[PDB]
Each structure stands twice: as structure tokens, then as C-alpha cells.
């Protein structure tokens, strides 16, 4: 938990970050700064993102693994990837 | 089409590139450098990939549109995004 808190501090301290969400293996948002309705949705939505893309990646090759999933949108970029036992979600302005 | 072809030559000319594929909205790989079975599979799950995320993003909000899909793997990084009427896919070694 502290790990995410250490990164959230610098993120929320810098300009560009819109909010950081953290979901556990159970699916519950252990921590989040986004909106109420925006967090609850992102929790499952994001969690399902890596879950869906994962089953697909397996088709890309026999021996593969997921460790990064970005999606540059029109509003902002939300970084999401599989962690030890949780799903990190970093939302902020676009970089591309 | 030519645009993608111009970028393919340079890519195939440089190291790192594993293989580039060019699929349309219908599902026909106008261009491909990978293997026979490797192309069909890639172009197969390709359309299924965008259709998967595009279906999820709809939950994030009403007004939006994906324009970048990157997935860092263990074998290589596969980046794909929506084009004029096709889906460009650049496969090569990892960058980050």
C-alpha cells in the first residue's frame, strides 16, 4: 500500500495527474482519488480491461505475459497494468 | 496504403522490428510481413482487440474515442491504433 501512496503523492503533487485508482484481487478499490461514480466504474472497467485483453494476448503467442496496457484517449491517458495482486491506474494528460 | 508501406520499408530496414501487419475494417490483411499462420492469427484477434476495448471505453464515458492501443509484452511490444480505414500494427522490441 505504502508503495502506491509514495507514487500517488508525487503524482497528485505534479500538474497533469487527474486521479489514481488502485484495485485489489477482490475487485475492491483499496484506494482512489477520482470521483465516486468515476472510481467505482473504473475499478471494474479497468480490471476487466486487463482481464479481457489478457485472454486475447494468449492468442498472439504461446508464451506471453501482460505487464502494461495503455490507451491514449481524447480526454486523457489512463495507464493500467497487472501488478503483484492489484491493478494500478494512473490517469493524466496525454503525452503523445 | 502507400503510407503504411513507406513505414514498413524503413522498419524492415532497421533492427528490432519483428513484423508489420496492415488490416482493414473488413478483416483483409492488405499487407503483412509475418508468417502465413502468424498473419491470419494476428489479423484475426486484431479486429477482436479494438472491438473489445472500444466496447469497454463506452462505459468510461459517452463522449470519447480511442486513438492509441499499446500492450507491452514479454516477447515484444505490439502497438495498434485506428487509421483512416485500416488498423496499423507495429511489432518490435520493447522501448519502456
Curated annotation (Swiss-Prot), chains A, B:
Q: Which GO terms describe its molecular function?
A: dynein intermediate chain binding; identical protein binding; microtubule motor activity
Which UniProt key words apply to this protein? Acetylation, Cytoplasm, Cytoskeleton, Dynein, Microtubule, Motor protein, Transport
Asked if the record carries the keyword Iron, the reply is no
Q: Give a Gene Ontology cellular component term annotated to this protein.
A: cytoplasm
Task: Please describe what this protein does.
Answer: Acts as one of several non-catalytic accessory components of the cytoplasmic dynein 1 complex that are thought to be involved in linking dynein to cargos and to adapter proteins that regulate dynein function. Cytoplasmic dynein 1 acts as a motor for the intracellular retrograde motility of vesicles and organelles along microtubules.
Any one Gene Ontology BP term = microtubule-based movement
Name the family the entry cites.
Belongs to the GAMAD family.
Q: Which species is the source of this protein?
A: Homo sapiens
* Cross-referenced InterPro entries: DYNLRB1/2, Roadblock/LAMTOR2_dom
Q: Which residues are recorded with the post-translational modification N-acetylalanine? A: 2
Protein name, per record: Dynein light chain roadblock-type 1
Q: How does it assemble?
A: Homodimer. The cytoplasmic dynein 1 complex consists of two catalytic heavy chains (HCs) and a number of non-catalytic subunits presented by intermediate chains (ICs), light intermediate chains (LICs) and light chains (LCs); the composition seems to vary in respect to the IC, LIC and LC composition. The heavy chain homodimer serves as a scaffold for the probable homodimeric assembly of the respective non-catalytic subunits. The ICs and LICs bind directly to the HC dimer and the LCs assemble on the IC dimer. Interacts with DYNLRB2. Interacts with DYNC1I1 and DYNC1I2.
Q: Where in the cell is it found?
A: Cytoplasm, Cytoskeleton
Q: In which tissues is it expressed?
A: High expression in heart, liver, brain and pancreas; moderate in placenta, skeletal muscle and kidney; low in lung, prostate, testis, small intestine and colon. Isoform 1 expression is up-regulated in 64% hepatocellular carcinoma (HCC) patients.
